[PDB]
Amino acid sequence: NPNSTSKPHVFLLASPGMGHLIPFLELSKRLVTLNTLQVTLFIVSNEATKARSHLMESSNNFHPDLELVDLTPANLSELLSTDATVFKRIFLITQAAIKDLESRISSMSTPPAALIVDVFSMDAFPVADRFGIKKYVFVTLNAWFLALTTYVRTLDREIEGEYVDLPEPIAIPGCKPLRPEDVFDPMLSRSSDGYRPYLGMSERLTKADGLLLNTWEALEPVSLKALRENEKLNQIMTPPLYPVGPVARTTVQEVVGNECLDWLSKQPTESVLYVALGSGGIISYKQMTELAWGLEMSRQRFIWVVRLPTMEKDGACRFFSDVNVKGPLEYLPEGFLDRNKELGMVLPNWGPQDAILAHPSTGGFLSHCGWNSSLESIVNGVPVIAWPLYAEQKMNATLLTEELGVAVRPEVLPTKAVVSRDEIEKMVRRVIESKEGKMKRNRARSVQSDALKAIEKGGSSYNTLIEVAKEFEKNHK
Ligand SMILES: O=c1ccn([C@@H]2O[C@H](COP(=O)(O)OP(=O)(O)O)[C@@H](O)[C@H]2O)c(=O)[nH]1
Numbered sequence: 067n068p069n070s071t072s073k074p075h076v077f078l079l080a081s082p083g084m085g086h087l088i089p090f091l092e093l094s095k096r097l098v099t100l101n102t103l104q105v106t107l108f109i110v111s112n113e114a115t116k117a118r119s120h121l122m123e124s125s126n127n128f129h130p131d132l133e134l135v136d137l138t139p140a141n142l143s144e145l146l147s148t149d150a151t152v153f154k155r156i157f158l159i160t161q162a163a164i165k166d167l168e169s170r171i172s173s174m175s176t177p178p179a180a181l182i183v184d185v186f187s188m189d190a191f192p193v194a195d196r197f198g199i200k201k202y203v204f205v206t207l208n209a210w211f212l213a214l215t216t217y218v219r220t221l222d223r224e225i226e227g228e229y230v231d232l233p234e235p236i237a238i239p240g241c242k243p244l245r246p247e248d249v250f251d252p253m254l255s256r257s258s259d260g261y262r263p264y265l266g267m268s269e270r271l272t273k274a275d276g277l278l279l280n281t282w283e284a285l286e287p288v289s290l291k292a293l294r295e296n297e298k299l300n301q302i303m304t305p306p307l308y309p310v311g312p313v314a315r316t317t318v319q320e321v322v323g324n325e326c327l328d329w330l331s332k333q334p335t336e337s338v339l340y341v342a343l344g345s346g347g348i349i350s351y352k353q354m355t356e357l358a359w360g361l362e363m364s365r366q367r368f369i370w371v372v373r374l375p376t377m378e379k380d381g382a383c384r385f386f387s388d389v390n391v392k393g394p395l396e397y398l399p400e401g402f403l404d405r406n407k408e409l410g411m412v413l414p415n416w417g418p419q420d421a422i423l424a425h426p427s428t429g430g431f432l433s434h435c436g437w438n439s440s441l442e443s444i445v446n447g448v449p450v451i452a453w454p455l456y457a458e459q460k461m462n463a464t465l466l467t468e469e470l471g472v473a474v475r476p477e478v479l480p481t482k483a484v485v486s487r488d489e490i491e492k493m494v495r496r497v498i499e500s501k502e503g504k505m506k507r508n509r510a511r512s513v514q515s516d517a518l519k520a521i522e523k524g525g526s527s528y529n530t531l532i533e534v535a536k537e538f539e540k541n542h543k
Pocket residue numbers: 083084085086088342343344345346347371415416417418419420435436437438439440442457
């Protein structure tokens with residue numbers, strides 16, 4: 067109908083990584099379901115995978131007014147080959163897409179009403195500025211991370227020497243102090259190639275017209291209050307703050323024909339441990355051997371997502387790929403798959419995590435505590451074995467364990483020492499079979515209740531998302 071009113075158009079931009087794409091897909095669907103917004107999500111990826119194709123295909127059929135556009139640049143072998151951390155390469159790949167984004171915006175009769183980018187994608191800000199587009203960052207991390215990020219440029223001036231050498235916890239104004247061993251990966255060495263980019267991220271976030279945050283009032287009342295009211299922090303991070311979390315898959319729709327899920331439905335309630343170290347997590351061959359034996363020795367049911375072990379060229383994580391279909395199985399102990407066929411299912415590379423964590427037969431989650439995975443454990447009330455590896459996962463693991471009370475963790479960080487099969491067996495038993503595990507599942511359940519309330523009608527995050535969506539609507543005004 068050419069005489070019908072057109073909805074205002076919101077653009078989103080997600081950088082490489084399942085942990086950026088998945089929450090951006092969920093936010094995009096939440097926005098479009100308000101029935102007042104045209105939504106286009108531009109996706110930048112590191113490579114083609116079956117997992118990404120299925121995610122994209124599902125989403126591009128969700129709603130008429132929701133569109134997905136693949137902006138992955140066509141000549142990535144050079145950028146992926148850069149001798150740099152995955153963290154830094156995410157920036158480099160995203161930068162290689164900005165010109166194409168600007169091309170898309172220029173061809174439009176009317177510019178988008180808003181642009182929402184992730185923390186790796188703020189090189190799109192000049193594009194927004196040229197077209198008069200309000201720019202928002204969807205910070206897909208938690209408030210504690212946002213506080214640290216707000217204040218890290220001050221920390222850079224005030225602390226001499228390495229953060230990891232400091233004697234006591236790092237004060238963050240108004241907030242829980244940060245243990246030196248828990249600092250965000252780029253802070254682990256001030257000579258790392260991600261440390262300066264992180265300082266730049268800190269500065270550029272202050273230039274946003276608004277910040278959407280994947281947390282909720284009931285989860286992080288102290289950190290949100292510090293961000294909002296502590297002069298040391300609200301003097302720096304001036305943009306308006308919108309907690310809209312949990313932005314996470316909270317409806318899983320029935321799957322026909324999935325071998326994993328069909329098997330899971332045959333297991334007893336709360337009996338299966340899901341084991342998956344995100345999309346990017348990798349472990350050494352030696353650690354993989356201990357984990358395999360730990361799971362076998364526990365005699366608990368499990369679903370274990372495995373990848374190729376760490377190689378010489380690997381850093382702290384690995385760009386997600388699914389072309390090594392069978393290779394990861396080659397690094398299990400001889401006969402493992404057949405020896406554990408009654409209780410254990412091993413999946414190379416990718417599993418249906420949303421459906422598994424929502425399944426009533428799942429009893430626990432051995433997680434690397436990436437923030438999306440953490441949220442998926444919370445929205446489903448699943449207790450956690452915390453196994454942080456990279457990014458801000460050590461902070462997340464501490465949040466889950468010390469503040470929420472929903473997690474068990476090894477004595478020593480897995481990045482500092484191999485976790486033995488004996489400790490693993492003990493952790494798995496504690497979470498799945500023991501009375502302590504029932505207590506942490508009940509705690510998780512309690513946390514879940516307030517998380518779901520936040521995004522249901524009338525919840526704090528639901529209303530905050532409405533408020534944000536009205537700013538986009540007024541931008542059109
Ligand atoms: O086998 C897997 C591994 C990961 N995921 C999903 O990929 C995302 C990983 O994001 P996260 O923030 O936990 O960590 P990342 O791997 O990006 O560091 C989550 O939404 C996972 O549910 C999945 O579906 N299947």
